[PDB]
Amino acid sequence: PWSEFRLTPAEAAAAAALAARCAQRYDETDGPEFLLDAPVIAHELPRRLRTFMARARLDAWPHALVVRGNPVDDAALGSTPVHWRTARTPGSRPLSFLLMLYAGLLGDVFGWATQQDGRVVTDVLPIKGGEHTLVSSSSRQELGWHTEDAFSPYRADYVGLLSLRNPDGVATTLAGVPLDDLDERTLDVLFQERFLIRPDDSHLQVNNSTAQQGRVEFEGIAQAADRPEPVAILTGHRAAPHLRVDGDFSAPAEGDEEAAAALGTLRKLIDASLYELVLDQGDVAFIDNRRAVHGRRAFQPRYDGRDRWLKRINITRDLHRSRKAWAGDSRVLGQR
Ligand SMILES: N=C(N)NCCC[C@H](O)[C@H](N)C(=O)O
Ligand SMILES: [Fe+2]
């Protein structure tokens, strides 16, 4: 259910060399300079890869695009960080650039004023004490399936994930719309504006740095949590709908029994068709955030310097779609 590409050694080396050159020339990934240049620099990537990315993006069926075979030297990389705050290590630097280059073939990258201090290139890694939270730094508790930033109309079209390391093979989970089992009445209800989708816990003040707690954009998160507006779960074509739902943060509209039954049914059908995608070291996946929901299986964290670690990036097909949420910065979204 995903499109797959495997780099040849020559292609992988060329891509790595390009990223390393970018890392030498630009101060950081999230600076305005590299954000503007990356989409043009990505034109220098191996031709066969560019062809795959162009064609896979135009395909109507896949839930994700996967590129296998980027080399990652664990010794050069260094230890997995204890927190995302300290995670921009020299060892991971070139791979962050590589991820942004691939992302540049698919769309415009952005972040959130209220998640990981407004960073564009973010980190997924287990944090000690947060094993049973509902955020991506969980471990022992399975990360429930969701549309990334399901609450927001400016959520990504694609979610990019590059696996820096994953020694114990922990699976990302994926599921599409369970179209073979949804009856037309239930389908009809899911297409109607009868559902509440609150922001997930990654947007909470306590999950950002103490110096950021005063940011005005947290007010907008509070309003979305306190007073969510009724929206549809399914949109577009009835035979190939787009999907907007979060398994832990969605609810029916108040007193709406038909919507409740429809959401209950959907949960059950998504649970039943959830499948696994293991991102091994050096794998990059771009998950279609409109066709599919995703999560991550429960795992026992190591906390020994070699924990599973991904770089992550939100991607949109059109940055100008979200101008209302441009928070004094077009690549960092949030509202009063
Ligand atoms: N537990 C759920 N159903 N949803 C939580 C949302 C998870 C997202 O990836 C979030 N941006 C994060 O990184 O924590
Ligand atoms: Fe996610």
Curated annotation (Swiss-Prot):
Entries under InterPro entries matching the protein: Alpha-KG_dependent_hydroxylase, Arginine_beta-hydroxylase, Clavaminate_syn-like, TauD-like_sf, TauD/TfdA-like
MF annotations from Gene Ontology: 2-oxoglutarate, L-arginine oxygenase (succinate-forming) activity; 2-oxoglutarate-dependent dioxygenase activity; iron ion binding
Positions with a binding annotation for Fe cation: H146, E148, H294
GO cellular component, one term: membrane
E.C. number(s) listed in UniProt: 1.14.11.41
Binding site for L-arginine: L134, V135, S136, D246, G247, D248, R312
Keyword Cell inner membrane set for record: no
Major subcellular location class: membrane
Any one GO BP annotation for this protein: antibiotic biosynthetic process
Claim: Nucleus is one of the keywords in the record: no
Name of protein: Alpha-ketoglutarate-dependent L-arginine hydroxylase
Organism: Streptomyces vinaceus
Source species taxonomy: Bacteria, Bacillati, Actinomycetota, Actinomycetes, Kitasatosporales
GN (gene name): vioC
